[PDB]
Design a protein around this nucleic acid. Sequence first.
RNA 1: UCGACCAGGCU
DNA 2: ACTACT
DNA 3: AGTAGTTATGCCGGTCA
Lengths: 65, 30, 56, 391, 134, 147, 114, 44, 181, 266
Amino acid sequence: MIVPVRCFSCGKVVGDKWESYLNLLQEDELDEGTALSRLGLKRYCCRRMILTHVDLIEKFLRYNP
Amino acid sequence: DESAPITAEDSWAVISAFFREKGLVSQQLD
Amino acid sequence: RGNLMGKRVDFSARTVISGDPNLELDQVGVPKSIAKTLTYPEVVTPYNIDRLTQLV
Amino acid sequence: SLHKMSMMAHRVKVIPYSTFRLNLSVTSPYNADFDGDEMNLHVPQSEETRAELSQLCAVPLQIVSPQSNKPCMGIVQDTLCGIRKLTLRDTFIELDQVLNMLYWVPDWDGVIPTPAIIKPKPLWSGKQILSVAIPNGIHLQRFDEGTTLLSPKDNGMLIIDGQIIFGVVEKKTVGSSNGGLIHVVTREKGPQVCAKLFGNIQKVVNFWLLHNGFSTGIGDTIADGPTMREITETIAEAKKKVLDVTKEAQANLLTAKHGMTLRESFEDNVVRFLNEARDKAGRLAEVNLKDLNNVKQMVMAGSKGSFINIAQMSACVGQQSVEGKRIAFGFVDRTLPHFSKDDYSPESKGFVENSYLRGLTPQEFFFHAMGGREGLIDTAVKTAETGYIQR
Amino acid sequence: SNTLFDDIFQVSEVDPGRYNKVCRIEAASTTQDQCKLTLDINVELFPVAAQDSLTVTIASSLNTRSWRPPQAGDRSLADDYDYVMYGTAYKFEEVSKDLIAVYYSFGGLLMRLEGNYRNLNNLKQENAYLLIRR
Amino acid sequence: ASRHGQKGTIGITYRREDMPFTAEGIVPDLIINPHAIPSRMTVAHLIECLLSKVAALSGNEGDASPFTDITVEGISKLLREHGYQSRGFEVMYNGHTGKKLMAQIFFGPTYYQRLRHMVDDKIHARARGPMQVLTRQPVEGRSRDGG
Amino acid sequence: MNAPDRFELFLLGEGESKLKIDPDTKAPNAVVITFEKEDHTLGNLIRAELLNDRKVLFAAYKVEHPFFARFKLRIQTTEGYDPKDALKNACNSIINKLGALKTNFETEWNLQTL
Amino acid sequence: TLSHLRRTNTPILAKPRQLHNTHWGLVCPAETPEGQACGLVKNL
Amino acid sequence: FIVEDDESLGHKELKVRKGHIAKLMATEYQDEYTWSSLLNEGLVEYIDAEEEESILIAMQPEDLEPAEADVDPAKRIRVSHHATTFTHCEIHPSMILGVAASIIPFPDHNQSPRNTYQSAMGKQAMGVFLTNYNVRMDTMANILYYPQKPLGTTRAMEYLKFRELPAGQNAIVAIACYSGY
Amino acid sequence: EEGPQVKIREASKDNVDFILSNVDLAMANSLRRVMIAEIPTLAIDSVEVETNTTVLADEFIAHRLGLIPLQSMDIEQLEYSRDCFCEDHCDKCSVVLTLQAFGESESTTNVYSKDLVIVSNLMGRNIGHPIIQDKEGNGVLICKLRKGQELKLTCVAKKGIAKEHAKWGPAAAIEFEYDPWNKLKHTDYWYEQDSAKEWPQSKNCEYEDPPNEGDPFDYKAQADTFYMNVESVGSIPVDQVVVRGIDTLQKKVASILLALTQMDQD
RNA sequence: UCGACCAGGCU
DNA sequence: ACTACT
DNA sequence: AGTAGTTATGCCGGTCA
Ligand SMILES: [Zn+2]
Ligand SMILES: [Zn+2]
């Protein structure tokens, strides 16, 4: 359901970090805890935003017209 | 030791197996 | 029992409620939208001709 | 609509957003919470119709209820919880703020009252400014226990000419209590005056609390290390006190109490052990909670919670039950199929030894359920039956 | 514009019963052995350890109405002490015999006195600034 | 509502500047009243927090499954290994004045559900309108504009 | 649906003034100024500065009710000194301080790397 | 939706409505409707 | 689980063993040793209500089996494996619950009835009921803009598909009296 | 230099840790709020959708487009359409962006905030440029599309402030602390055994002299020296989110003098 | 103009 | 599910 | 025995002539 642009709590941009994070996991084979710190997501308000997103949009796309 | 006992965390593997096969609405279907 | 000892009536309104530590014990915050639906039949008196004409 | 007070007349105040807003203290009479309750409103149509409302059923008039010859609206939640805090001898307030607090009271005669303390720093005490809300001529006196015109424990309550002299202000003083600060101000000064009293007492306390803040978390539910160990044994010992009573009953060495079976007389003793036990486990923790504890602080003001709560949360839940008897033998001579027949021990008839902080065990859990589900049931029957009677 | 009581006492003991900023104190008079004292004190803006020579006073002034801030940088100041409160006297108990006791409340912080010579002094009036030095 | 039979409606909304904050700059999305805890005795709520607050920092899915070997004591160790007070509580500042709050406030994430039932689908009002046919009385239903 | 436009928080609505000064009758030489379309940001700040003018016998401010961006400020000053003036100074005073602060912050910032 | 599919009815105060011991493992202890048909509607 | 004491090398013990299990996760990773396998290989059995009457069951397979020869002060307080007649063992207690309840975090820490409400409330919530919502013409429907999976979970959720189709968001929550609103 | 001083500790392109000293709490705070709420910025605030066949709904997308940060360096020289005299809007008051995406690739085509295309005349000035801090330089994944999924939009960024909507805020979080060693007693720590052991010490404890028992309670002690840290979303350079804040708040204080003036007339 | 019956959900 | 009356 | 009468308030899909 697409990454939220900016965190509800503090508003820090986070729309960009999606793809970067998904890599630091798959490719750079890191752990969420670090991948997040790597992307500069300090406090939990920003952390919880990415760590918890459920990119449903993908299953959506997979439909057709 | 493919015959040692089986602790806590283990049971889950089994539970997973159950749902793999039967699924959350078996009853209605069967 | 359902038409005479009690009945549905005109000039009534209902919605969710929520406290407000800023109203006097006996006030009742009314949503503007509701204030604009519910009405009162005031009679034209030299005392209020002006106020009333203004509202009309 | 159960009594007069479920339908009172209020003054309109047209406002934004979509929800009827009401003053917290008129909360009880209607029995409304904000879980989503809805309320109806009827607008009078005649010149006399409205007269009947304003003159006969206006919220200020309804304040002191004839149902039980005492007031039916008091101070609650935040305001109650906070009014206590703002009161404690320990509570001192400085100029900058005392000034705002004064301003907040709509009647304040624009007379900064003399600081109880001038000495190094000019300070005002909670009891002081709160008294600015309290009108003149209001005389009140109480005495709880160790009360003594110099109440060392800051007990009772002594107010003179509308000024707090001593004692913490909590429920017994400003709640819908009988000798209430309210029951008095109404009678003494009039429905009108007392009506605006909720108004001020709230605006001041409410304000103060906004800045002082207040909260609560698991941290408030864990009892001190030894005070815990101490509890476990208080349960353990009561466990044996019951174990014995059991063997002593298996040897046929019991005195069937007149009018009771051996078994009837057996359980009676049993149960009285576990409860008597639990209650102590509780009073143990309850006393081990310092005054900084928030859950305790609420129980002190009387805004929310009670003994039993602190108990089942930090000490020991207690013995579940159904129709009186402890959990029965739904299964042939046993509670669950994880037990061996004819087991009467507590860890089988439904004694939940664990606290809520600790977490019930699969058995404790299912028994508690069984117990709960019974409440929900009659709660749902008690209601329709209650209703028909009322009609 | 005058005092109503004066004397030095000695702190029998100071007690903080569940009170982080206030202690209740009690001391005897270094004169009449009838003059007792109990007083609540903000031991944060004026600490007090048992066994001390404190000079107590009273009087209805400092040389009332709406209170004013300092500005008194240069003003009158019966402030010749290190702790001055203001409160009201609520009860005038008769500890029998010819020993009288008066009670004062300073917006919460209480106090009790004894003896019997402020017969035309310790007025029952609300006035009463309490002062303490040393 | 939370997942502990802890229902409630909004009663006002505030913006970051008015909201109380922690020196770290974090601010709440909700503010629930301490009072709806004591009597409800729904400690799990309090824990789901301490747990989810850690899990947010650690990036490791928190396990709040039924009967496990987890404890408030363990969780507090980890939340301490992260620099924050052990029990959740944090110092906070009153957004209007910026001064501190004499009290510390339980803070941290908690799963909240937005259930159906929104005021603007309920708020209803009538002043004369549709009338039934047999009865000649006001029809029924907000939909039908009844009374 | 019953929500007021956000811009009502700051745009002075059809015929309103930022200030409206009315003489408090309760006590002598004191007034109440209503700040329209304004909030704590301004209130608490003017309240604080105002609490320095040693000729200011009283000074507080409240936000009547959250729903509305507006607050009342009550100022009382020693005789002969008019409060309206007190308000002025307290204001300039604030501005001046903010000016210094702007400069000073800028300085420190120029004297930086990264 | 899951919950609705694993739902039970019990056409018909006291005995039936309550949570039995034999109910352990077969029916949910906590999930039941409030009031009226309380304990009469069960969930597997 | 079947416990038959068939341990010529010790006491009574669960038929299923670490090999049987590691043999299952083998098939999991491959996405041949199903459930039916655990069943026909007489490892687990279907106990109806009636039969339940005549059997003895252990909770934790572990704890309720080995001998007894200290204890954590924070953990709760479990009874014991006071038995040897153990015919069967509970796969996992948490399975006494049902779909609804299975989402409640730490239910074993709430007052029994609390759990009953959250059970009927989660049914009023809003989420993503299906991924094909975009294509359905159902009268009325609510989809949450940005669903999040919960920070605190239940091993049980996994099978309920909660993390994939959540119904709520993790909000930074403060418990405090503030404006009194 | 003169009144309330500063001493910038660390400082980068996104954050500006610093120590505001010799200031009033009132002020320290007001500034904090102002930085969050009233500094003017430019953000999309009108989306005319011509075509959309994504899985997202029009307003879902429109929403996002608003939070997407945009250049606001020279925002001070753009007008609020509400003040500009055109009927509706112009280059004197707005920036118009364009978005057009089509799934050509047989593999999920990604719409980024880098695909926004200014159309209105910028009249030469830093404004309306999709701020990108992304490593690949795409910044903010607006949305995804499949096969023949198209998305044709038009945007109209306008000047605004937090109070109207958050999308206009430039700050996004702001650290703020003071008196790390509770010397003022502005708090009363909760605890079980020891406040000190249980309550973490702050990084700021260092930059301030510890308590030391003996000493009595310094009540005279007021409170200056605040350890703040202003982070920025980007629309404006961190230093600016501080100066501009300092300025905005100032003008506000000014308008009150000004107001008292026209009110002098009568 | 606009009804009945049934069933289900919220307080 | 409960309860009284002809 | 047989014989009837009740049962909380209020609000918010789907077939039938
Ligand atoms: Zn954030
Ligand atoms: Zn224009």
